[PDB]
């Protein structure tokens, strides 16, 4: 996954936690 503020792709695994709108935002 990725830890908060980490870039990722918002469609499948991004964060740890929740979504990627630019960056984990949570």
Same mark, same amino acid.
């Not at 990722?8 to 709108?21: E, K, Q, R, Y």
């Given at each position: 996954?990725?830890?908060? !503020?980490?870039? +990722? !792709? @918002?469609?499948?695994? !991004?964060?740890?936690?929740?979504? +990627?709108?630019? @960056?984990?935002?949570?």
């Amino acid at each position: 996954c990725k830890q908060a !503020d980490e870039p +990722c !792709d @918002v469609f499948s695994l !991004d964060c740890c936690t929740g979504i +990627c709108l630019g @960056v984990c935002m949570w």
